[PDB]
PDB file of N, CA and C in Angstrom:
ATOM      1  N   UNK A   1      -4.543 -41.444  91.198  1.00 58.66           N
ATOM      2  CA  UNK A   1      -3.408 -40.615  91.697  1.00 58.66           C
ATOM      3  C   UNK A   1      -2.714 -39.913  90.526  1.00 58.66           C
ATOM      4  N   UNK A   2      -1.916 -39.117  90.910  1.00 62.66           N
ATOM      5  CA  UNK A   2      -0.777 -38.499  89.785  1.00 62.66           C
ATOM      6  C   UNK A   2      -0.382 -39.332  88.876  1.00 62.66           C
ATOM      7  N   UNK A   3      -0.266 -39.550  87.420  1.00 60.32           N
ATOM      8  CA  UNK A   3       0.147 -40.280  86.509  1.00 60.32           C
ATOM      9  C   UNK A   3       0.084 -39.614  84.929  1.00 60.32           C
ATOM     10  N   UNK A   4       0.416 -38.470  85.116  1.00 60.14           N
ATOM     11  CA  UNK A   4       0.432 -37.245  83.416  1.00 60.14           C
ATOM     12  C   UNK A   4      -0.351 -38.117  82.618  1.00 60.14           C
ATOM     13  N   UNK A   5      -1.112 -37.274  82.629  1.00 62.35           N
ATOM     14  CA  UNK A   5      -2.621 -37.489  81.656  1.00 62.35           C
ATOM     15  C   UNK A   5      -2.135 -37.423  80.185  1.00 62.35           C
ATOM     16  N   UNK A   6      -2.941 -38.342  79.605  1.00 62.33           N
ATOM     17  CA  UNK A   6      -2.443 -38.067  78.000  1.00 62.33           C
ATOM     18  C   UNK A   6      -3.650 -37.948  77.428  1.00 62.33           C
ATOM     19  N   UNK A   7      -3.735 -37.784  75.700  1.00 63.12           N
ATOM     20  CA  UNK A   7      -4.899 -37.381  75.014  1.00 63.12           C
ATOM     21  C   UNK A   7      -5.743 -38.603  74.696  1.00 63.12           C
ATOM     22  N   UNK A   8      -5.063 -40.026  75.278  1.00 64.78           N
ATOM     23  CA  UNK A   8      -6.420 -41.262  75.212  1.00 64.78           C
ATOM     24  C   UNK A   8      -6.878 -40.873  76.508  1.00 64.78           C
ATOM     25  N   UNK A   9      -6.806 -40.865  77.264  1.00 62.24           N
ATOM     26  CA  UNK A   9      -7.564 -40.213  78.619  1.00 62.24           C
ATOM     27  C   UNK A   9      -8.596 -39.725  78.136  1.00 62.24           C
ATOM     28  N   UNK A  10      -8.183 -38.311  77.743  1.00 60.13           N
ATOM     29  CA  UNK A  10      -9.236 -37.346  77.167  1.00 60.13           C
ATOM     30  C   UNK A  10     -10.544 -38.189  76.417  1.00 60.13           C
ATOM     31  N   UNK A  11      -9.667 -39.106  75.600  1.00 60.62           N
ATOM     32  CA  UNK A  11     -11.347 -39.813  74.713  1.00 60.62           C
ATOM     33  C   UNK A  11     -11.270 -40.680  75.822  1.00 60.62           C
ATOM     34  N   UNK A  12     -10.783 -41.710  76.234  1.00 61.72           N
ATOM     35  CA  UNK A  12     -11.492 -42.577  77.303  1.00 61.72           C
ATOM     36  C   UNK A  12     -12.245 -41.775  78.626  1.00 61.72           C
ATOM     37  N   UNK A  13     -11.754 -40.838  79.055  1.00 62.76           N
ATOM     38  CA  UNK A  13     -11.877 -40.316  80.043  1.00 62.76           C
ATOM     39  C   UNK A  13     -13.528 -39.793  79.705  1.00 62.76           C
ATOM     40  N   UNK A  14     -13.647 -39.191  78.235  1.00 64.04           N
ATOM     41  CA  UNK A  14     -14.280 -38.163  78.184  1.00 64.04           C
ATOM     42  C   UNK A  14     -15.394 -39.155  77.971  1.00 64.04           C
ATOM     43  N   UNK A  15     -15.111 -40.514  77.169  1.00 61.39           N
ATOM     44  CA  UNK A  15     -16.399 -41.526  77.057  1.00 61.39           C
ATOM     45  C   UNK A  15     -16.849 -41.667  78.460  1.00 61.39           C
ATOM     46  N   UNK A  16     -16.064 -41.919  79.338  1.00 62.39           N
ATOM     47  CA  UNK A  16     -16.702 -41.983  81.079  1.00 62.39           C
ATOM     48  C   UNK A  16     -17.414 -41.012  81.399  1.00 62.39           C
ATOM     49  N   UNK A  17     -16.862 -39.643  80.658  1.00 59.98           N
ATOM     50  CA  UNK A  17     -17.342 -38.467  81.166  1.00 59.98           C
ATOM     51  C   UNK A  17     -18.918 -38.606  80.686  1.00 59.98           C
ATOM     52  N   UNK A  18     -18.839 -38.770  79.019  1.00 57.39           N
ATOM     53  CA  UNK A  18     -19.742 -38.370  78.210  1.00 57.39           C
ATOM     54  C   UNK A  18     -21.107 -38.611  78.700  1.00 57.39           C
ATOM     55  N   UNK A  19     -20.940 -39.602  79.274  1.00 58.99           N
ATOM     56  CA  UNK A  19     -22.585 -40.405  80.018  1.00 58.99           C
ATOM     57  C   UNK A  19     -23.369 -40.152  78.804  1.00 58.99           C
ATOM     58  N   UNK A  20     -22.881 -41.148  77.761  1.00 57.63           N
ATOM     59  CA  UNK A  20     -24.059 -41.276  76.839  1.00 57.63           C
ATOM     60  C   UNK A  20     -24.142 -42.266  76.478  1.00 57.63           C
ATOM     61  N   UNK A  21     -25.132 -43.207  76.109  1.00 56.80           N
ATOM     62  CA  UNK A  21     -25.388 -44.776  75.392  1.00 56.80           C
ATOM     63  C   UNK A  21     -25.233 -45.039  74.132  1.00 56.80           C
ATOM     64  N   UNK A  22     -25.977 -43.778  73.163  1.00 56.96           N
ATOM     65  CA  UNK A  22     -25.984 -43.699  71.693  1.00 56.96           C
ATOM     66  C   UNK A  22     -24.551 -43.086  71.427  1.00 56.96           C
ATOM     67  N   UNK A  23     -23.438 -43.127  72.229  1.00 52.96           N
ATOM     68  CA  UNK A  23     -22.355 -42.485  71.429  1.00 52.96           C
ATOM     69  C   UNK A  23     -21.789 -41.069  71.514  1.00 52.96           C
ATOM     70  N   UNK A  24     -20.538 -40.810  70.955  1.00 52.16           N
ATOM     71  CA  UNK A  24     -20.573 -39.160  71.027  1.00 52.16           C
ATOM     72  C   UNK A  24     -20.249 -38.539  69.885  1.00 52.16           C
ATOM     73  N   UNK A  25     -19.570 -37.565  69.390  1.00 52.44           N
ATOM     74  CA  UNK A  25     -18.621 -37.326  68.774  1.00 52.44           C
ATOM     75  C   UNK A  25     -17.619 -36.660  68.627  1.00 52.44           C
ATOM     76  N   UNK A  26     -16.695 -36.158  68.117  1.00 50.92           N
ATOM     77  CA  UNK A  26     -15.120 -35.560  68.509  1.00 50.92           C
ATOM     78  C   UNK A  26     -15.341 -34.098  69.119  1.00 50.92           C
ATOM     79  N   UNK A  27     -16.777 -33.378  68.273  1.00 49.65           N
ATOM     80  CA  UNK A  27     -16.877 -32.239  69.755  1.00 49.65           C
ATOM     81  C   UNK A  27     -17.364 -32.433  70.917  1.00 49.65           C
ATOM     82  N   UNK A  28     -18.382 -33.685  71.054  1.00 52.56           N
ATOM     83  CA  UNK A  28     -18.493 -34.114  71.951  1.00 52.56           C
ATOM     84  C   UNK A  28     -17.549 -34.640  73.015  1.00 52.56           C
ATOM     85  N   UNK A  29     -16.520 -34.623  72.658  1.00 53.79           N
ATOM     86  CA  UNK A  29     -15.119 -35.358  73.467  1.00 53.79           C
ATOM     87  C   UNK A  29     -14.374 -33.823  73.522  1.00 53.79           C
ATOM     88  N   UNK A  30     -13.813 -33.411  72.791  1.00 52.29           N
ATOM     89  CA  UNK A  30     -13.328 -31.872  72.994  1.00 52.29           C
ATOM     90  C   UNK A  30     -14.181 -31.348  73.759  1.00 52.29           C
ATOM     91  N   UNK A  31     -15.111 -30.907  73.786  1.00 51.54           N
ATOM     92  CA  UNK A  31     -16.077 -30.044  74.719  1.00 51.54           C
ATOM     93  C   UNK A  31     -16.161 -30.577  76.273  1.00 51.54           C
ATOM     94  N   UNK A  32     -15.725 -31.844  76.469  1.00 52.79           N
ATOM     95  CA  UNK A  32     -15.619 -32.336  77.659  1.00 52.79           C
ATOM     96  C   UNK A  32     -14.278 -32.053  78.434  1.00 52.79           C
ATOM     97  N   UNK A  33     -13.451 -32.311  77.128  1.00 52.20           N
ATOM     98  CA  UNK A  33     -11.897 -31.848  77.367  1.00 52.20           C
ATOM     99  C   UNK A  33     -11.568 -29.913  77.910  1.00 52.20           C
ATOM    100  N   UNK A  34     -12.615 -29.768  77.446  1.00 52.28           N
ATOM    101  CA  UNK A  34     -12.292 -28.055  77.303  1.00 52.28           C
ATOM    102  C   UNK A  34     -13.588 -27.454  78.552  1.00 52.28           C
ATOM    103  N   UNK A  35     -14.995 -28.328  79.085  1.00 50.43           N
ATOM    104  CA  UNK A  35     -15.561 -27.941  79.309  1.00 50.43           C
ATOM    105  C   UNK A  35     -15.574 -28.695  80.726  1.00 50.43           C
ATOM    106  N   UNK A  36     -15.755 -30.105  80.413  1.00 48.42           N
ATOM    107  CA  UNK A  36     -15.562 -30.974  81.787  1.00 48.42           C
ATOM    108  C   UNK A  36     -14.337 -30.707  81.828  1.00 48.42           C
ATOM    109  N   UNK A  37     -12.985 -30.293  81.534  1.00 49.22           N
ATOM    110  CA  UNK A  37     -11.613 -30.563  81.685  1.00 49.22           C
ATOM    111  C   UNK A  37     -11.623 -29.104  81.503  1.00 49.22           C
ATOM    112  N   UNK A  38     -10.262 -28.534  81.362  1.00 54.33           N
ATOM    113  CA  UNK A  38      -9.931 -27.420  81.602  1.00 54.33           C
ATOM    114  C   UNK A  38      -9.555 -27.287  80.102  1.00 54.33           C
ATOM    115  N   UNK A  39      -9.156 -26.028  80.052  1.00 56.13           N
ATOM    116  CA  UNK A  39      -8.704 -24.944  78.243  1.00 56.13           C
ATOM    117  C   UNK A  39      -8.237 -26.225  77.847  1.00 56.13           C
ATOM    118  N   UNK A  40      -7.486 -27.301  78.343  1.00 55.31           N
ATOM    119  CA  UNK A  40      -6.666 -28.018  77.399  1.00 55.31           C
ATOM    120  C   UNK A  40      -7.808 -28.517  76.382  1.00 55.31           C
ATOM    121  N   UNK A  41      -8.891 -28.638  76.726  1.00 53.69           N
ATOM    122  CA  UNK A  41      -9.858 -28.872  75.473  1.00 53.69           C
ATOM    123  C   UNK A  41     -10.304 -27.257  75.333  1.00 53.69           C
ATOM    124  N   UNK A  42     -10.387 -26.350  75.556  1.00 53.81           N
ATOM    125  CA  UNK A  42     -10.642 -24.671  75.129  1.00 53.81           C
ATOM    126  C   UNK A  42      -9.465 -24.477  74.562  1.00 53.81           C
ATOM    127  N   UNK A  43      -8.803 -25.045  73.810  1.00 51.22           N
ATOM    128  CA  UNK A  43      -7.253 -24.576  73.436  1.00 51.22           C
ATOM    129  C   UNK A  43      -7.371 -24.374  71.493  1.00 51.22           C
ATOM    130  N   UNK A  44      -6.583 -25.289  70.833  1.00 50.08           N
ATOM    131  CA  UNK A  44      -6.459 -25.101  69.589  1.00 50.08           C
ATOM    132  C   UNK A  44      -6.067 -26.327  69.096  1.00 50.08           C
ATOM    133  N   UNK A  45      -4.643 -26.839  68.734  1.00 49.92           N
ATOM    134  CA  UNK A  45      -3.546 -27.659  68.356  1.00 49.92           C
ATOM    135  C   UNK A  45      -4.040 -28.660  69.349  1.00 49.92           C
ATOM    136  N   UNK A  46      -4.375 -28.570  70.326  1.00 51.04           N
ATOM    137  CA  UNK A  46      -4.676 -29.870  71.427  1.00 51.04           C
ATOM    138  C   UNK A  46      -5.761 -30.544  70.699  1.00 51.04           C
ATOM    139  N   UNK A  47      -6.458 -30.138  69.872  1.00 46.16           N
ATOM    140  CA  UNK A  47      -7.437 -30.541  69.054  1.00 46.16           C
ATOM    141  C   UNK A  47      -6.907 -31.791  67.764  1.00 46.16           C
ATOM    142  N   UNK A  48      -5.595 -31.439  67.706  1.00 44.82           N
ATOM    143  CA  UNK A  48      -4.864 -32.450  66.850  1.00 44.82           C
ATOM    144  C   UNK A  48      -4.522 -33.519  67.586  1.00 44.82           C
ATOM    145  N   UNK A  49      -3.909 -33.313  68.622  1.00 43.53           N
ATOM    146  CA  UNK A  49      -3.633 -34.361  69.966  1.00 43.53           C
ATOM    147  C   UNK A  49      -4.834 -35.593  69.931  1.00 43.53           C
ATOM    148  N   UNK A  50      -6.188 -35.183  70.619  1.00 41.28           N
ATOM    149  CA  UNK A  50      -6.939 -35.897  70.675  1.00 41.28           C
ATOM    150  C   UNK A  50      -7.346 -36.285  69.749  1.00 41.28           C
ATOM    151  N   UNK A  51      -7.507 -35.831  68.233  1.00 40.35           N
ATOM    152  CA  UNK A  51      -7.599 -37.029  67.490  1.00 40.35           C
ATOM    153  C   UNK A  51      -7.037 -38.078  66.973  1.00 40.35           C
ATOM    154  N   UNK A  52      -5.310 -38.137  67.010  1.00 43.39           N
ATOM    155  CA  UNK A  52      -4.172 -38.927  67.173  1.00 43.39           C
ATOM    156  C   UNK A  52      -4.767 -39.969  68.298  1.00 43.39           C
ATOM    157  N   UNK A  53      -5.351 -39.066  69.359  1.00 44.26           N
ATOM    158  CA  UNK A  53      -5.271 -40.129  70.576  1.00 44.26           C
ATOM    159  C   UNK A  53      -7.225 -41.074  70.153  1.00 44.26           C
ATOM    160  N   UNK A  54      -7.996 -40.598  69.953  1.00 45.99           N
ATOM    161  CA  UNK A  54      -9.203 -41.205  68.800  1.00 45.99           C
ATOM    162  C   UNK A  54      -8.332 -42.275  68.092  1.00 45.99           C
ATOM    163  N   UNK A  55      -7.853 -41.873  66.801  1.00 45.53           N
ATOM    164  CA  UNK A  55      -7.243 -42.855  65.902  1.00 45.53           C
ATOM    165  C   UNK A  55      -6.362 -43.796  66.720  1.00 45.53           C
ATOM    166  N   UNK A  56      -5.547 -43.575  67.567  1.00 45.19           N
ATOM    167  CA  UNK A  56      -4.487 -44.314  68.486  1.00 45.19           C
ATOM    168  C   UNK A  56      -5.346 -45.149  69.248  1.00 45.19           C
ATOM    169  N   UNK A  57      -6.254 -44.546  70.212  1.00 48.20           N
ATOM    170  CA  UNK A  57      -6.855 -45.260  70.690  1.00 48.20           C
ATOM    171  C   UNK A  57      -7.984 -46.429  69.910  1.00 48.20           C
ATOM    172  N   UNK A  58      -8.966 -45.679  68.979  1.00 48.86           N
ATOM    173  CA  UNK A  58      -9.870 -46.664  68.179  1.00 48.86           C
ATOM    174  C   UNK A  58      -8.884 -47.807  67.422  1.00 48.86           C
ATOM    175  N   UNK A  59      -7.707 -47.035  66.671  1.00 50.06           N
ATOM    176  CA  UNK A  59      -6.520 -48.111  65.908  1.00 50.06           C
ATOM    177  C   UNK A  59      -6.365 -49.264  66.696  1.00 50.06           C
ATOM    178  N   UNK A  60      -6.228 -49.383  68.072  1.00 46.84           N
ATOM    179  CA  UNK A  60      -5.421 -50.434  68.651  1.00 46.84           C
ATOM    180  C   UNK A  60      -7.219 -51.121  69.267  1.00 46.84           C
ATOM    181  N   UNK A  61      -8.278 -50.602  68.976  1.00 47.23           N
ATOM    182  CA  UNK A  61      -9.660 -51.335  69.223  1.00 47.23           C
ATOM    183  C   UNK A  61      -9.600 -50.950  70.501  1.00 47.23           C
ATOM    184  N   UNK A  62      -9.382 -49.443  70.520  1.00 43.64           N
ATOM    185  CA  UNK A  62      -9.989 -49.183  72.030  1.00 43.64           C
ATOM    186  C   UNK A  62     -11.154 -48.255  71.999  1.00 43.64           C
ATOM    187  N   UNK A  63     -11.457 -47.428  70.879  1.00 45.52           N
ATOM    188  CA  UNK A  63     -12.905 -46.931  71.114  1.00 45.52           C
ATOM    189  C   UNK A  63     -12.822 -47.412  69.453  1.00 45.52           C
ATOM    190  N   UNK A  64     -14.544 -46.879  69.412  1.00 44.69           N
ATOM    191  CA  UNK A  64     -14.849 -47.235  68.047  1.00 44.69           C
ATOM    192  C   UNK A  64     -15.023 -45.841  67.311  1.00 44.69           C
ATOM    193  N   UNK A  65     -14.681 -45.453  66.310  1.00 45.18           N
ATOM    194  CA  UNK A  65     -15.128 -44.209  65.427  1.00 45.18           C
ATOM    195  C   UNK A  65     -15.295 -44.339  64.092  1.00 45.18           C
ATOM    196  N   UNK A  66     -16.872 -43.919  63.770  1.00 44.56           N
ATOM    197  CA  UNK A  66     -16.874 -44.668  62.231  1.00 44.56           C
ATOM    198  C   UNK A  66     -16.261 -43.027  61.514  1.00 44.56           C
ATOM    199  N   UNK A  67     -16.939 -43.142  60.037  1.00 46.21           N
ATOM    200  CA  UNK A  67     -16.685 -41.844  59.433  1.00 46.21           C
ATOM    201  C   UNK A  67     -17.873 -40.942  59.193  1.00 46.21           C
ATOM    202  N   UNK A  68     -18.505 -41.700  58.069  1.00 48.51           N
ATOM    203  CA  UNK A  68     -20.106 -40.861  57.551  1.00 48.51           C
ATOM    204  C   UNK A  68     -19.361 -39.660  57.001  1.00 48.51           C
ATOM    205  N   UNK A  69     -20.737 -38.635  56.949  1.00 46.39           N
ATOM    206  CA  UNK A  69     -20.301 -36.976  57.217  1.00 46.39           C
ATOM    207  C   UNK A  69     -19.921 -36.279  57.920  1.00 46.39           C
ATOM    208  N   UNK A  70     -19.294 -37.221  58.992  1.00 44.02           N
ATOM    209  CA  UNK A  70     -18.182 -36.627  60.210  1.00 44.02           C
ATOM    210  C   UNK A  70     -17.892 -37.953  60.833  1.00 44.02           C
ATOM    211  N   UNK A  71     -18.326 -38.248  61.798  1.00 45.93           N
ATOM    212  CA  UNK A  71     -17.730 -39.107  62.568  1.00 45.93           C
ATOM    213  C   UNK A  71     -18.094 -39.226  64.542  1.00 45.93           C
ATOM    214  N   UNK A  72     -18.419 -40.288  64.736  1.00 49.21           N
ATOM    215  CA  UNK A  72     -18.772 -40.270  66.198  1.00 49.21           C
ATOM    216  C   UNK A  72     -18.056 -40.985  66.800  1.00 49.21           C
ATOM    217  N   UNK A  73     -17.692 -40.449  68.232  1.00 49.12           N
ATOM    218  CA  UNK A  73     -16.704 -41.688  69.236  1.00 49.12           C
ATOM    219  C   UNK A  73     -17.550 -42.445  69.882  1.00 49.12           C
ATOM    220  N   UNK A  74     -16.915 -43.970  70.209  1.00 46.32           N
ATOM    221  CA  UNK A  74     -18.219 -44.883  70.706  1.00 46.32           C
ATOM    222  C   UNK A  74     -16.886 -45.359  71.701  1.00 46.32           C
ATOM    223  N   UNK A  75     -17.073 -45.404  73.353  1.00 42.35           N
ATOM    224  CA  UNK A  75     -15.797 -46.511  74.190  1.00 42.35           C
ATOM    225  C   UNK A  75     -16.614 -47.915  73.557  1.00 42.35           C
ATOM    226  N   UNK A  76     -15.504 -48.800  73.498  1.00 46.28           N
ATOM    227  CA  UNK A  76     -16.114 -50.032  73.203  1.00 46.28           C
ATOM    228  C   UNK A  76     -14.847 -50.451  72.206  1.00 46.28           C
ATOM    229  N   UNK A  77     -14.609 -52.042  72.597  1.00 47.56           N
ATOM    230  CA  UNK A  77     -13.644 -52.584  71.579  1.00 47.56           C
ATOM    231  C   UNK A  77     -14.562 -53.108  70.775  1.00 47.56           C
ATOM    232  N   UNK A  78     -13.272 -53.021  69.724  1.00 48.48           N
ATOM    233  CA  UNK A  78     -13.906 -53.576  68.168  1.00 48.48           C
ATOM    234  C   UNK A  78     -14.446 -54.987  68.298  1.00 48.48           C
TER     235      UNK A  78
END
């Protein structure tokens, strides 16, 4: 039901969305936001949002994101 969506949505949401096993990564989650979801992932600055909500969310061991030469989102606690 109605409950204002926030930008862990977007990565949790978008891991539901993502339907992938091996993982995603942050365009992989934006592109869902902007592509499965509306402009709010086609936008700009919302791009800062969701990675606050990545770090917020992975920080508290709610998805996993390593670093490397970029970085992939995984749902899954630490």
């Amino acid at each position: 039901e109605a409950s204002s969506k926030s930008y862990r949505e977007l990565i949790i949401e978008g891991l539901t969305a993502l339907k992938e096993r091996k993982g995603s990564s942050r365009p992989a989650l934006k592109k869902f936001i902007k592509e499965n979801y509306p402009i709010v992932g086609s936008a700009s600055n919302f791009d800062l949002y969701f990675n606050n909500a990545i770090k917020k969310g992975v920080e508290a061991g709610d998805f996993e994101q390593p670093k490397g030469p970029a970085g992939a989102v995984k749902l899954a606690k630490k």
